Design a protein around this ligand. Structure first.
Ligand code: NAD
Ligand code: NAD
Ligand code: ZN
Ligand code: ZN
Lengths: 253, 249
């Protein structure tokens, strides 16, 4: 944490209310003076290839928008842009102490908010979330979502509840949304997803039993699609798409 | 979520990160046994065809940690952990952190809602890595500065915002021990309500580096041969599960 000088440089995440400043559609890069940031306060949130990544908690007049717009960057830098967006919301969300009502102040030694009155504190909230590609022989279960409305057929996802494992969360979400039981559950990777603050844990699984019965609150439609006859898919750069490619590349025939 | 009547099952009576443990054990039976009739409860799960209830209440005697009841079956201990964490979730959002007004709970999910500014919160689960680092016939085991109890265990740390589980493993191992690892394999996960972690358990393999410990986290660390292990964390912890899987090789 520090006040920005003229000869500070790097990547500047100027963020407020889940948006960040992307003039010309790009993450600002360069010297502080080129963005009128001298004298402002910033937290260094990481480093990319020799360059500090800076979080400035500030609203600009124009070009504020979604961090999704810089998802074409190297994954490592896009994760760091998302860190800034999530940190600015973390601070905004703990202006007051939840236990106490009293105003909070930020730690100097880590990402945390401390109460001026209570002994209590908070750290940023990461929301663990499962996402699973279910295979049935030569086919993959794909579904359209009620709250999306986008023509994309994708795999099944949901937030982990308190007191449950990732494995229980997969079995519970698959059952609730689609009525099927799965076997041979297998972890493959994870992915920070700042929309607003999820951590994806990505799984493959195999069909075991049951018939597709939908919860219409979550799914408009679900079905088994043969690996070479697929519909429209979620974009590259999501673990969902990678899970579907891996499952296709598996189908061995 | 409603008022309790003379109702049955497992009772998680929790205030300020403790629950009521008469005789050291979880209360089980009808509401009248425990002077609970007319109080407010939330059903938080089901165990062997019987409800598990959370009552947000302080008792005068025998309040304790959920750790006392870890000898229960994993599935029930998970539910008692849920009640403790749920009670602390509600207490931690009496007030809205955005605008400062009092919140009120959702009736359709576990959530706290703000009438005044229309933001909400869900229960915080803190993802946390734990990893058994294997080197041929050997496993990395460390003594912790926090507990100081003769127990040699594996390495663990909280995942950061913006990082993967894989980067969190590599980072925590590097910061605590100085070694670089490879061949990360996921094994399992486990809720750990102390106060609110979700452990994601990994195996890794020694790639390179020498052991140089952070004396603010570790007192000591070394490579132990799989059949000549020091005192290990108690069975039933996820740390013990990790070590026993790597011993089995
Ligand atoms: N990277 C990917 O491949 C990928 C793909 C799909 C979804 N996702 C992410 O996974 C998350 C969940 O997907 P979804 O469509 O099932 O939910 P959603 O995107 O429809 O989110 C809204 C609902 O989640 C519910 N919920 C329960 N617990 C929550 C918690 N801790 N935090 C926030 N919301 C909670 C709330 O009721 C809320 O109405 C989302 O963050 C989504 O962006 C990532
Ligand atoms: N299941 C098992 O067998 C097992 C074994 C070992 C450790 N664990 C868990 O993993 C943790 C690792 O030990 P420890 O060093 O964190 O002890 P700790 O709980 O005392 O750590 C607290 C410190 O870590 C940071 N911290 C706490 N919560 C955080 C959060 N959400 N986000 C970021 N940072 C946070 C803070 O700096 C704090 O000073 C343990 O606290 C415990 O919960 C589980
Ligand atoms: Zn306070
Ligand atoms: Zn509010």
């Amino acid at each position: 944490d520090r006040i920005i000088e003229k000869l500070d440089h790097g990547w500047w995440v100027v963020s407020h209310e889940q948006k960040l400043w992307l003039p010309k559609g790009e993450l600002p890069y360069g010297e502080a003076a080129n963005f009128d940031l001298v004298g402002q306060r910033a937290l260094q949130i990481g480093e990319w290839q020799g360059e500090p990544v800076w979080l400035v908690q500030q609203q600009r007049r124009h070009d504020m928008g979604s961090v999704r717009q810089v998802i074409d960057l190297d994954v490592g830098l896009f994760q760091l842009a998302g860190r800034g967006v999530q940190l600015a919301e973390f601070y905004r969300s703990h202006k007051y102490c939840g236990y106490c009502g009293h105003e909070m102040y930020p730690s100097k030694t880590e990402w945390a908010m401390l109460c001026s009155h209570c002994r209590e504190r908070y750290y940023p909230q990461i929301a663990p979330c499962i996402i699973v590609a279910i295979r049935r022989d030569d086919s993959i279960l794909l579904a359209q979502h009620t709250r999306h409305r986008n023509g994309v057929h994708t795999v099944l996802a949901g937030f982990v509840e308190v007191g449950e494992t990732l494995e229980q969360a997969v079995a519970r979400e698959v059952m609730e949304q689609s009525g099927i039981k799965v076997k041979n559950l297998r972890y493959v990777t994870s992915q920070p997803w700042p929309f607003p603050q999820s951590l994806m844990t990505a799984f493959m699984a195999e069909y075991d039993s049951g018939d597709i019965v939908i919860d219409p609150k979550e799914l408009l439609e679900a079905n088994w699609y043969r690996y070479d006859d697929l519909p429209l898919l979620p974009p590259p750069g999501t673990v969902a798409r990678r899970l579907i490619e891996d499952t296709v590349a598996m189908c061995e025939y």
